[PDB]
Amino acid sequence: AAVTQSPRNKVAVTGGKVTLSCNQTNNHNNMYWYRQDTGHGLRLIHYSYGAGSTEKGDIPDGYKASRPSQENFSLILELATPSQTSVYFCASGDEGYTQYFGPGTRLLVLEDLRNVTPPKVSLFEPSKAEISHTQKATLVCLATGFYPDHVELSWWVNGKEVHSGVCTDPQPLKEQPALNDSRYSLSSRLRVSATFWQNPRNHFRCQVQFYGLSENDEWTQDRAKPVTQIVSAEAWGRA
Amino acid sequence: TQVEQSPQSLVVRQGENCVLQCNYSVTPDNHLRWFKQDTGKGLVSLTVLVDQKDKTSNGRYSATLDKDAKHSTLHITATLLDDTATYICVVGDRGSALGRLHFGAGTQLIVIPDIQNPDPAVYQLRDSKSSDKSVCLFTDFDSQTNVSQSKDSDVYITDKCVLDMRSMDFKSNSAVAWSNKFACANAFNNSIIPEDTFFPS
Amino acid sequence: NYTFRCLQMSSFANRSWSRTDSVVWLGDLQTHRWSNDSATISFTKPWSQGKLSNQQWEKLQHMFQVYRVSFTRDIQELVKMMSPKEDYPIEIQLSAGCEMYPGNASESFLHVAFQGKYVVRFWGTSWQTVPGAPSWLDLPIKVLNADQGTSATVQMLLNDTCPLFVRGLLEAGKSDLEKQEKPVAWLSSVHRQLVCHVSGFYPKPVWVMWMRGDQEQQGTHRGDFLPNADETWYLQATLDVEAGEEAGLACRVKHSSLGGQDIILYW
Amino acid sequence: QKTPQIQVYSRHPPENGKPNILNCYVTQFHPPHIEIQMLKNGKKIPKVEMSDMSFSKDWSFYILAHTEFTPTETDTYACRVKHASMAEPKTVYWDRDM
Ligand SMILES: *[C@@H]1O[C@H](CO[C@@H]2O[C@@H](C)[C@@H](O)[C@@H](O)[C@@H]2O)[C@@H](O[C@@H]2O[C@H](CO)[C@@H](O[C@@H]3O[C@H](CO[C@H]4O[C@H](CO)[C@@H](O)[C@H](O)[C@@H]4O)[C@@H](O)[C@H](O[C@H]4O[C@H](CO)[C@@H](O)[C@H](O)[C@@H]4O)[C@@H]3O)[C@H](O)[C@H]2NC(C)=O)[C@H](O)[C@H]1NC(C)=O
Ligand SMILES: CCCCCCCCCCCCCC[C@@H](O)[C@@H](O)[C@@H](N)CO[C@H]1O[C@H](CO)[C@H](O)[C@H](O)[C@H]1O
Ligand SMILES: CCCCCCCCCCCCCCCC(=O)O
Ligand SMILES: *[C@@H]1O[C@H](CO)[C@@H](O)[C@H](O)[C@H]1NC(C)=O
Ligand SMILES: *[C@@H]1O[C@H](CO)[C@@H](O)[C@H](O)[C@H]1NC(C)=O
């Protein structure tokens, strides 16, 4: 009994309309919208007992809800505010007590979009000293100069995402710790066997999904519009 | 706030056990669920207890519930690195869809990895598209070592971070340092690093 | 051959406002009350706890206390589930308990009524609708039957706790149940319609006729049993007659309290 | 919706000057929200006792108002009932016989 949410990650300005959606092919009558804030547990915003019903939950102020059909239950922030920065969970259920949870949706509501910038990505290749001393090769990737901090760094090898042998920083570190809206940097390592790196037919690639502006956000500045994009760096193996 | 969890957080070495608490005032109490939230991800269910005096297991996860005391514990035997997570307690006040779920704030487990054979080194990695730029990588140190923030502000040093080559059963702490303004012998001056560290070249 | 009854009445005026008031009968005598204002069930007799211990009663009363709050929210939630099909004001009524037969025997019931119409009952191990009920209740029924904890409890209450408890009451309240109080009668009038009033008698069965000599006036219209405040009964028999034909007419009354010596009032 | 039937009657046999109790019995009504007043000469009697509400086998409600009274030659008594089913309040007067 699966449930999906969309978008998975979102950056918004104060005053904008933001709409979080939730799809469910379970024929579950009932659907639920929660928000998780570090400090509290999940609190119920709205819910629906079938197509056409929507109910106030525990903390419904600021959110409108919409159940157009059995499959889709939406949460609408008509006038977005900084207080609505959260992680929004959606869930569905039949007549029983279980609620089958979605994967979550992160939302950051900013005051103004002037500082929004995508990352530069660099990929740094394994040391020959490391290869000989350990029989292992550590690639390192480096996302820098990006704001806000909503990024997903992933590693791909021959077009297939690798999880084994990866570590990514828990939180990104600030380039200008003094400044209010400082840019960030974020490192990640992929460690493989030296023979796997020495094989020149293995294509390594670090990919950073940056979440930023929509195509319907205004942009008054001279520079390139900092949109939700992918930036990546790439390297082949070498013996 | 009708569901309380204890401790708020805890750090444990890999291999040790730990017991997580959950006490509630919710009335009535049909069932109690333990969730597991990885950093970033969503809610994986571990077990659901439904009786007056109930007990369950799920491999290394085992759990109890006493509805008279209104109290539940979640034991984790032989912790592994992947257990680093937040552990959420949830009480449902009906045995049907009519009920509400009351969520706890969560107990934050952090598990220190067990590095058997350290071999601490500081290597230099070169950029693929542009040889001139580079990073200094401090790797292969045991979890007793604390990687310290940068002395300079124009120099950047990340915190430590553990990777896991699952097919080899191998774990290693690592930390990256870099700057536009700098060399790898002088890069981790400000950390109390092992005296037998291997600076090559 | 007594019947035990828990009558519950619940009014939901709008989504926020509601109230639930119960009363409990054993035959025609009240044994308990439970106002919305009271947090706890009140006895209306000395013997109302029955043969239950003080700690058994507490765990039983606490079950009801929790049920009452849970009942209210669930109805309110079922209105949201069905809307716009149904909306307030809503009037739900329960009637539950058991009838006692000689030896071991008893039947238990639990009947529910929606807006004054019997629609649902608990039977066997589940809630089910009755003949006549509208088909939209099928979803409410489906949801209530998902609650496997509620079913097991209601089964235990109907099958065990109730029939056991009532035996406690029957033994514990023998002297009140088997009481014998005498009627008092009087005559009056308003063709003319003579009226023979009878009042103060217990138990309910009584015989009241107009007579001329030994000849039962088969024009006698018996009225209904009306209750007095002191837990006795009232009943009047009327007879239509020609003006100036009241001579020779007498009201005869038989009741188990009198023992042979019947009340006769002459005009 | 259902109309209430009202029945006024005394506990003991009516003798002028002698104390007594006057019952008013209201039945067969729905919904259960109802206002009941026992009247003397039009004026509302102050200390009126009310039984708990209940209902019959046909799910229709009933209730018994009662009050002490001392019948006289001159004084008339009554029971007034307001209900959602009725347009205006219904008043049945004590018969002097019942
Ligand atoms: C409490 O008493 C219940 C019965 O008492 C009545 O209801 C209560 C609430 C009061 O109103 C009281 O005054 C009444 O007298 C009692 O309910 C019985 O529970 C059993 C099982 O727990 C039920 O048995 C199952 O029946 C189905 C089919 O039944 C249908 O047909 C019969 C006709 O014979 C009808 O009478 C029924 O209404 C049904 O329509 C079987 O298919 C099923 O068999 C399957 O499962 C069993 C294992 O459990 C296997 O042996 C079989 O191979 C099958 O796989 C069950 O046997 C029974 O129907 C039900 N009786 C009634 C009259 O509904 C309840 O158990 C008591 N609870 C406690 C806790 O004491
Ligand atoms: C407009 C819709 C009309 C509805 C008509 C339906 C009539 C049925 C009315 C009776 C239903 C029973 C009400 C109470 C029940 O739903 C529960 O809310 C109540 N028994 C509490 O149950 C919880 O707590 C129990 C412990 O005492 C159990 O844990 C149970 O599992 C749990 O749900
Ligand atoms: C013996 C005194 C009882 C007084 C209170 C009785 C009023 C309610 C009667 C209906 C009982 C319904 C049973 C449901 C029980 C439950 O689900 O917990
Ligand atoms: C609900 O109804 C009650 C009584 O009928 C009334 O006093 C109250 O004002 C109503 N509440 C709302 C919110 O409409
Ligand atoms: C009935 O009681 C509940 C709590 O037991 C209360 O919240 C509610 O307002 C009461 N309603 C009325 C009409 O008295």
PDB file of C-alpha atoms in Angstrom, chain C residues 56-265:
ATOM      1  CA  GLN C  56     -15.395  -4.144  40.430  1.00  0.00           C
ATOM      2  CA  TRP C  57     -17.826  -1.238  40.258  1.00  0.00           C
ATOM      3  CA  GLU C  58     -14.943   1.257  39.859  1.00  0.00           C
ATOM      4  CA  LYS C  59     -13.445  -0.578  36.850  1.00  0.00           C
ATOM      5  CA  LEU C  60     -16.949  -0.875  35.349  1.00  0.00           C
ATOM      6  CA  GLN C  61     -17.790   2.814  35.941  1.00  0.00           C
ATOM      7  CA  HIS C  62     -14.418   3.883  34.508  1.00  0.00           C
ATOM      8  CA  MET C  63     -15.164   1.853  31.344  1.00  0.00           C
ATOM      9  CA  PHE C  64     -18.420   3.820  30.967  1.00  0.00           C
ATOM     10  CA  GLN C  65     -16.761   7.189  31.729  1.00  0.00           C
ATOM     11  CA  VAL C  66     -14.286   6.555  28.876  1.00  0.00           C
ATOM     12  CA  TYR C  67     -16.987   5.156  26.544  1.00  0.00           C
ATOM     13  CA  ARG C  68     -19.119   8.310  26.978  1.00  0.00           C
ATOM     14  CA  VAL C  69     -16.351  10.671  25.787  1.00  0.00           C
ATOM     15  CA  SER C  70     -15.372   8.232  23.004  1.00  0.00           C
ATOM     16  CA  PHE C  71     -18.994   7.753  21.916  1.00  0.00           C
ATOM     17  CA  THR C  72     -19.449  11.509  21.424  1.00  0.00           C
ATOM     18  CA  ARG C  73     -16.402  12.043  19.224  1.00  0.00           C
ATOM     19  CA  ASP C  74     -17.061   8.949  17.078  1.00  0.00           C
ATOM     20  CA  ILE C  75     -20.618  10.087  16.231  1.00  0.00           C
ATOM     21  CA  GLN C  76     -19.252  13.568  15.413  1.00  0.00           C
ATOM     22  CA  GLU C  77     -16.645  11.881  13.201  1.00  0.00           C
ATOM     23  CA  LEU C  78     -19.216   9.642  11.485  1.00  0.00           C
ATOM     24  CA  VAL C  79     -21.218  12.799  10.575  1.00  0.00           C
ATOM     25  CA  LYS C  80     -18.094  14.164   8.806  1.00  0.00           C
ATOM     26  CA  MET C  81     -17.609  10.855   7.035  1.00  0.00           C
ATOM     27  CA  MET C  82     -21.172  10.795   5.674  1.00  0.00           C
ATOM     28  CA  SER C  83     -21.673  14.562   5.047  1.00  0.00           C
ATOM     29  CA  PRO C  84     -23.320  16.084   3.150  1.00  0.00           C
ATOM     30  CA  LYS C  85     -25.645  12.994   3.311  1.00  0.00           C
ATOM     31  CA  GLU C  86     -26.408  13.690   6.977  1.00  0.00           C
ATOM     32  CA  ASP C  87     -26.002  16.704   9.274  1.00  0.00           C
ATOM     33  CA  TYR C  88     -27.120  18.025  12.698  1.00  0.00           C
ATOM     34  CA  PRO C  89     -29.330  18.085  14.726  1.00  0.00           C
ATOM     35  CA  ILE C  90     -28.872  14.319  15.318  1.00  0.00           C
ATOM     36  CA  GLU C  91     -30.582  12.193  17.970  1.00  0.00           C
ATOM     37  CA  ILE C  92     -29.033   8.812  18.785  1.00  0.00           C
ATOM     38  CA  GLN C  93     -30.652   6.472  21.349  1.00  0.00           C
ATOM     39  CA  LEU C  94     -29.296   3.173  22.742  1.00  0.00           C
ATOM     40  CA  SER C  95     -31.241   0.468  24.564  1.00  0.00           C
ATOM     41  CA  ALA C  96     -29.099  -2.303  26.067  1.00  0.00           C
ATOM     42  CA  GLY C  97     -29.334  -4.922  28.785  1.00  0.00           C
ATOM     43  CA  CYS C  98     -30.731  -8.399  29.309  1.00  0.00           C
ATOM     44  CA  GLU C  99     -33.958 -10.212  30.198  1.00  0.00           C
ATOM     45  CA  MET C 100     -33.850 -12.796  33.007  1.00  0.00           C
ATOM     46  CA  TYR C 101     -35.594 -16.175  32.747  1.00  0.00           C
ATOM     47  CA  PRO C 102     -35.708 -18.934  35.423  1.00  0.00           C
ATOM     48  CA  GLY C 103     -32.709 -21.222  35.996  1.00  0.00           C
ATOM     49  CA  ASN C 104     -29.619 -20.251  33.991  1.00  0.00           C
ATOM     50  CA  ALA C 105     -31.408 -18.483  31.125  1.00  0.00           C
ATOM     51  CA  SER C 106     -31.034 -14.933  29.732  1.00  0.00           C
ATOM     52  CA  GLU C 107     -30.998 -13.061  26.393  1.00  0.00           C
ATOM     53  CA  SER C 108     -28.966  -9.858  25.895  1.00  0.00           C
ATOM     54  CA  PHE C 109     -29.816  -6.986  23.527  1.00  0.00           C
ATOM     55  CA  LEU C 110     -28.205  -3.751  22.329  1.00  0.00           C
ATOM     56  CA  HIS C 111     -30.411  -1.719  20.001  1.00  0.00           C
ATOM     57  CA  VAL C 112     -29.557   1.659  18.533  1.00  0.00           C
ATOM     58  CA  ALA C 113     -31.978   4.216  17.072  1.00  0.00           C
ATOM     59  CA  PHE C 114     -31.238   7.110  14.698  1.00  0.00           C
ATOM     60  CA  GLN C 115     -33.685  10.054  14.773  1.00  0.00           C
ATOM     61  CA  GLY C 116     -36.249   7.875  16.611  1.00  0.00           C
ATOM     62  CA  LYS C 117     -36.000   4.923  14.200  1.00  0.00           C
ATOM     63  CA  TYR C 118     -34.443   1.552  15.159  1.00  0.00           C
ATOM     64  CA  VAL C 119     -31.593   1.053  12.652  1.00  0.00           C
ATOM     65  CA  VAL C 120     -28.686  -0.902  14.213  1.00  0.00           C
ATOM     66  CA  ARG C 121     -28.004  -3.635  16.774  1.00  0.00           C
ATOM     67  CA  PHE C 122     -25.105  -5.599  18.203  1.00  0.00           C
ATOM     68  CA  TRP C 123     -25.640  -9.285  17.470  1.00  0.00           C
ATOM     69  CA  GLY C 124     -23.215 -12.195  17.683  1.00  0.00           C
ATOM     70  CA  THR C 125     -19.774 -10.610  17.272  1.00  0.00           C
ATOM     71  CA  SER C 126     -20.659  -7.519  15.205  1.00  0.00           C
ATOM     72  CA  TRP C 127     -22.784  -4.483  14.532  1.00  0.00           C
ATOM     73  CA  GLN C 128     -25.386  -4.951  11.805  1.00  0.00           C
ATOM     74  CA  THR C 129     -28.342  -2.976  10.478  1.00  0.00           C
ATOM     75  CA  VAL C 130     -31.972  -4.110  10.756  1.00  0.00           C
ATOM     76  CA  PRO C 131     -34.735  -4.351   8.116  1.00  0.00           C
ATOM     77  CA  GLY C 132     -35.944  -0.856   7.150  1.00  0.00           C
ATOM     78  CA  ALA C 133     -32.591   0.890   7.741  1.00  0.00           C
ATOM     79  CA  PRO C 134     -31.187   3.165   5.013  1.00  0.00           C
ATOM     80  CA  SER C 135     -28.244   1.736   3.080  1.00  0.00           C
ATOM     81  CA  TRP C 136     -25.771   4.614   3.874  1.00  0.00           C
ATOM     82  CA  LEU C 137     -25.260   3.201   7.397  1.00  0.00           C
ATOM     83  CA  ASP C 138     -23.287   0.390   5.690  1.00  0.00           C
ATOM     84  CA  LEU C 139     -20.117   2.525   5.903  1.00  0.00           C
ATOM     85  CA  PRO C 140     -20.540   3.476   9.622  1.00  0.00           C
ATOM     86  CA  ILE C 141     -21.220  -0.232  10.259  1.00  0.00           C
ATOM     87  CA  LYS C 142     -18.076  -1.203   8.309  1.00  0.00           C
ATOM     88  CA  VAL C 143     -15.965   1.218  10.373  1.00  0.00           C
ATOM     89  CA  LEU C 144     -17.429   0.197  13.765  1.00  0.00           C
ATOM     90  CA  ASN C 145     -16.802  -3.490  12.907  1.00  0.00           C
ATOM     91  CA  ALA C 146     -13.137  -2.729  12.145  1.00  0.00           C
ATOM     92  CA  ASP C 147     -12.740  -1.864  15.879  1.00  0.00           C
ATOM     93  CA  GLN C 148     -11.969  -5.402  17.084  1.00  0.00           C
ATOM     94  CA  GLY C 149     -11.276  -4.136  20.623  1.00  0.00           C
ATOM     95  CA  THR C 150     -14.777  -2.608  20.940  1.00  0.00           C
ATOM     96  CA  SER C 151     -16.402  -5.855  19.714  1.00  0.00           C
ATOM     97  CA  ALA C 152     -14.649  -8.117  22.260  1.00  0.00           C
ATOM     98  CA  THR C 153     -15.731  -5.759  25.079  1.00  0.00           C
ATOM     99  CA  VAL C 154     -19.394  -5.435  23.979  1.00  0.00           C
ATOM    100  CA  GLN C 155     -19.525  -9.248  23.628  1.00  0.00           C
ATOM    101  CA  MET C 156     -18.203  -9.624  27.222  1.00  0.00           C
ATOM    102  CA  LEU C 157     -20.700  -7.015  28.505  1.00  0.00           C
ATOM    103  CA  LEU C 158     -23.714  -8.620  26.818  1.00  0.00           C
ATOM    104  CA  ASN C 159     -22.727 -12.282  27.366  1.00  0.00           C
ATOM    105  CA  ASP C 160     -21.202 -12.180  30.898  1.00  0.00           C
ATOM    106  CA  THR C 161     -21.068  -8.913  32.854  1.00  0.00           C
ATOM    107  CA  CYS C 162     -24.733  -7.913  32.392  1.00  0.00           C
ATOM    108  CA  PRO C 163     -26.495 -11.255  33.140  1.00  0.00           C
ATOM    109  CA  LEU C 164     -24.162 -11.813  36.132  1.00  0.00           C
ATOM    110  CA  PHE C 165     -24.790  -8.287  37.481  1.00  0.00           C
ATOM    111  CA  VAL C 166     -28.580  -8.524  37.148  1.00  0.00           C
ATOM    112  CA  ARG C 167     -28.650 -11.703  39.292  1.00  0.00           C
ATOM    113  CA  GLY C 168     -26.782  -9.627  41.884  1.00  0.00           C
ATOM    114  CA  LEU C 169     -29.462  -6.925  41.710  1.00  0.00           C
ATOM    115  CA  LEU C 170     -32.390  -9.365  41.855  1.00  0.00           C
ATOM    116  CA  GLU C 171     -31.087 -10.959  45.067  1.00  0.00           C
ATOM    117  CA  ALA C 172     -29.905  -7.609  46.497  1.00  0.00           C
ATOM    118  CA  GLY C 173     -33.234  -5.822  45.836  1.00  0.00           C
ATOM    119  CA  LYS C 174     -35.777  -8.522  46.721  1.00  0.00           C
ATOM    120  CA  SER C 175     -37.799  -6.473  49.235  1.00  0.00           C
ATOM    121  CA  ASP C 176     -38.155  -3.396  46.955  1.00  0.00           C
ATOM    122  CA  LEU C 177     -39.045  -5.522  43.877  1.00  0.00           C
ATOM    123  CA  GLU C 178     -41.554  -7.744  45.720  1.00  0.00           C
ATOM    124  CA  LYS C 179     -43.127  -4.769  47.548  1.00  0.00           C
ATOM    125  CA  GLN C 180     -46.932  -4.603  47.872  1.00  0.00           C
ATOM    126  CA  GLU C 181     -48.586  -1.153  48.167  1.00  0.00           C
ATOM    127  CA  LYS C 182     -52.380  -0.649  48.261  1.00  0.00           C
ATOM    128  CA  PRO C 183     -54.498   1.400  45.837  1.00  0.00           C
ATOM    129  CA  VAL C 184     -56.811   4.186  46.937  1.00  0.00           C
ATOM    130  CA  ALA C 185     -59.840   4.901  44.746  1.00  0.00           C
ATOM    131  CA  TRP C 186     -62.378   7.691  44.247  1.00  0.00           C
ATOM    132  CA  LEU C 187     -65.283   8.611  41.938  1.00  0.00           C
ATOM    133  CA  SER C 188     -66.127  11.632  39.740  1.00  0.00           C
ATOM    134  CA  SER C 189     -67.854  12.711  36.476  1.00  0.00           C
ATOM    135  CA  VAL C 190     -67.765  15.131  33.485  1.00  0.00           C
ATOM    136  CA  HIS C 191     -74.657  11.708  28.236  1.00  0.00           C
ATOM    137  CA  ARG C 192     -72.360  11.611  31.286  1.00  0.00           C
ATOM    138  CA  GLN C 193     -68.961   9.928  31.737  1.00  0.00           C
ATOM    139  CA  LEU C 194     -68.308   8.517  35.229  1.00  0.00           C
ATOM    140  CA  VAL C 195     -64.646   8.028  36.203  1.00  0.00           C
ATOM    141  CA  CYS C 196     -63.138   5.613  38.732  1.00  0.00           C
ATOM    142  CA  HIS C 197     -59.655   6.782  39.767  1.00  0.00           C
ATOM    143  CA  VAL C 198     -57.177   4.333  41.330  1.00  0.00           C
ATOM    144  CA  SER C 199     -53.747   5.341  42.710  1.00  0.00           C
ATOM    145  CA  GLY C 200     -50.834   4.259  44.934  1.00  0.00           C
ATOM    146  CA  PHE C 201     -50.720   0.563  43.912  1.00  0.00           C
ATOM    147  CA  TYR C 202     -47.710  -1.671  43.222  1.00  0.00           C
ATOM    148  CA  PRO C 203     -46.962  -3.864  41.350  1.00  0.00           C
ATOM    149  CA  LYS C 204     -48.470  -2.881  37.987  1.00  0.00           C
ATOM    150  CA  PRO C 205     -51.145  -5.613  37.474  1.00  0.00           C
ATOM    151  CA  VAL C 206     -54.639  -4.495  38.605  1.00  0.00           C
ATOM    152  CA  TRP C 207     -58.330  -5.165  37.793  1.00  0.00           C
ATOM    153  CA  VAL C 208     -60.841  -2.271  37.523  1.00  0.00           C
ATOM    154  CA  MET C 209     -64.500  -2.549  36.446  1.00  0.00           C
ATOM    155  CA  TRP C 210     -67.797  -0.731  36.741  1.00  0.00           C
ATOM    156  CA  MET C 211     -70.526  -2.965  38.185  1.00  0.00           C
ATOM    157  CA  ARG C 212     -74.266  -3.123  38.734  1.00  0.00           C
ATOM    158  CA  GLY C 213     -74.734  -5.980  41.219  1.00  0.00           C
ATOM    159  CA  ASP C 214     -72.662  -8.949  40.001  1.00  0.00           C
ATOM    160  CA  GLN C 215     -72.905  -7.790  36.355  1.00  0.00           C
ATOM    161  CA  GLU C 216     -69.724  -6.413  34.719  1.00  0.00           C
ATOM    162  CA  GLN C 217     -70.483  -3.260  32.697  1.00  0.00           C
ATOM    163  CA  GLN C 218     -68.749  -4.128  29.395  1.00  0.00           C
ATOM    164  CA  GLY C 219     -68.842  -0.427  28.367  1.00  0.00           C
ATOM    165  CA  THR C 220     -65.931   0.222  30.801  1.00  0.00           C
ATOM    166  CA  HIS C 221     -63.035   1.985  29.031  1.00  0.00           C
ATOM    167  CA  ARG C 222     -59.753   1.308  30.826  1.00  0.00           C
ATOM    168  CA  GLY C 223     -57.125   4.096  30.592  1.00  0.00           C
ATOM    169  CA  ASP C 224     -53.313   3.889  30.586  1.00  0.00           C
ATOM    170  CA  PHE C 225     -50.932   3.236  33.461  1.00  0.00           C
ATOM    171  CA  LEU C 226     -49.615   6.664  34.585  1.00  0.00           C
ATOM    172  CA  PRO C 227     -46.722   6.819  37.118  1.00  0.00           C
ATOM    173  CA  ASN C 228     -46.758   8.599  40.500  1.00  0.00           C
ATOM    174  CA  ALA C 229     -43.523  10.209  41.808  1.00  0.00           C
ATOM    175  CA  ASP C 230     -43.218   7.718  44.724  1.00  0.00           C
ATOM    176  CA  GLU C 231     -42.790   4.725  42.322  1.00  0.00           C
ATOM    177  CA  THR C 232     -46.434   3.614  42.402  1.00  0.00           C
ATOM    178  CA  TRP C 233     -49.037   3.701  39.587  1.00  0.00           C
ATOM    179  CA  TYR C 234     -52.275   5.430  38.571  1.00  0.00           C
ATOM    180  CA  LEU C 235     -55.154   4.200  36.397  1.00  0.00           C
ATOM    181  CA  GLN C 236     -58.684   5.365  35.636  1.00  0.00           C
ATOM    182  CA  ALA C 237     -61.642   3.491  34.170  1.00  0.00           C
ATOM    183  CA  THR C 238     -64.482   5.473  32.541  1.00  0.00           C
ATOM    184  CA  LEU C 239     -68.080   4.444  31.689  1.00  0.00           C
ATOM    185  CA  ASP C 240     -70.623   6.382  29.593  1.00  0.00           C
ATOM    186  CA  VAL C 241     -74.173   6.489  31.012  1.00  0.00           C
ATOM    187  CA  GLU C 242     -77.589   8.153  30.650  1.00  0.00           C
ATOM    188  CA  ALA C 243     -78.208  11.170  32.922  1.00  0.00           C
ATOM    189  CA  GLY C 244     -79.919   9.967  36.123  1.00  0.00           C
ATOM    190  CA  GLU C 245     -78.778   6.334  35.576  1.00  0.00           C
ATOM    191  CA  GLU C 246     -75.877   6.511  38.074  1.00  0.00           C
ATOM    192  CA  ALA C 247     -77.861   4.728  40.819  1.00  0.00           C
ATOM    193  CA  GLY C 248     -76.734   1.131  41.469  1.00  0.00           C
ATOM    194  CA  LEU C 249     -73.273   1.619  39.919  1.00  0.00           C
ATOM    195  CA  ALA C 250     -70.137   0.590  41.772  1.00  0.00           C
ATOM    196  CA  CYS C 251     -66.426   0.538  40.991  1.00  0.00           C
ATOM    197  CA  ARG C 252     -64.758  -2.748  41.955  1.00  0.00           C
ATOM    198  CA  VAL C 253     -60.949  -2.988  42.222  1.00  0.00           C
ATOM    199  CA  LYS C 254     -58.824  -6.128  42.701  1.00  0.00           C
ATOM    200  CA  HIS C 255     -55.098  -5.960  43.485  1.00  0.00           C
ATOM    201  CA  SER C 256     -52.529  -8.332  45.057  1.00  0.00           C
ATOM    202  CA  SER C 257     -51.961  -5.863  47.935  1.00  0.00           C
ATOM    203  CA  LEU C 258     -55.574  -6.184  49.198  1.00  0.00           C
ATOM    204  CA  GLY C 259     -55.724  -9.995  49.682  1.00  0.00           C
ATOM    205  CA  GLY C 260     -59.345 -11.021  49.064  1.00  0.00           C
ATOM    206  CA  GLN C 261     -60.975  -7.862  50.460  1.00  0.00           C
ATOM    207  CA  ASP C 262     -61.672  -5.844  47.296  1.00  0.00           C
ATOM    208  CA  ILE C 263     -62.354  -2.105  47.165  1.00  0.00           C
ATOM    209  CA  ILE C 264     -65.962  -1.316  46.176  1.00  0.00           C
ATOM    210  CA  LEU C 265     -67.139   2.307  45.792  1.00  0.00           C
TER     211      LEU C 265
END
